[PDB]
Amino acid sequence: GSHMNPPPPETSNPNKPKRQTNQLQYLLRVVLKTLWKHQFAWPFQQPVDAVKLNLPDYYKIIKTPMDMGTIKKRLENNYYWNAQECIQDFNTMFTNCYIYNKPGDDIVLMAEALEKLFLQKINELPTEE
Numbered sequence: 001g002s003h004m005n006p007p008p009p010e011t012s013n014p015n016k017p018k019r020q021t022n023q024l025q026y027l028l029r030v031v032l033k034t035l036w037k038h039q040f041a042w043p044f045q046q047p048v049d050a051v052k053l054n055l056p057d058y059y060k061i062i063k064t065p066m067d068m069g070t071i072k073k074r075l076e077n078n079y080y081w082n083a084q085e086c087i088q089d090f091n092t093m094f095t096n097c098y099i100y101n102k103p104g105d106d107i108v109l110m111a112e113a114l115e116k117l118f119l120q121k122i123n124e125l126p127t128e129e
């Protein structure tokens with residue numbers, strides 16, 4: 001894509017130690033699955049293309065970009081060590097949305113719908129085996 005967008009967040013790095021936990025499996029099989037398929041998922045399924053969306057200040061404001069495309073790749077490619085790292089990525093995606101966009105903008109209502117499902121699922125994050 002455009003050189004004016006940053007490189008996406010890292011999804012592969014052999015230097016970072018990896019593990020596959022029952023909680024990370026839940027995060028892919030329940031949490032990501034639930035949000036990915038939601039009618040409102042599409043703005044969150046890949047990094048923000050600030051060029052295409054004509055948001056030139058997006059990456060001036062948002063210095064910790066995250067999206068569900070990146071999280072899906074992280075989960076499928078076993079990038080994470082623990083559930084907290086993955087939960088932190090989802091919370092970053094939501095907070096970035098609420099910081100950048102005006103409250104009650106469509107994008108905000110979409111994030112809110114996903115976040116509601118997210119909280120319900122995360123309260124049921126299984127005990128670590």
Ligand SMILES: Cn1cc(Br)cc(N)c1=O
Pocket residue numbers: 043044048053096097100101107
């Ligand atoms: C996350 N997200 C996605 C799209 Br599309 C447009 C935005 N303003 C945004 O914040």
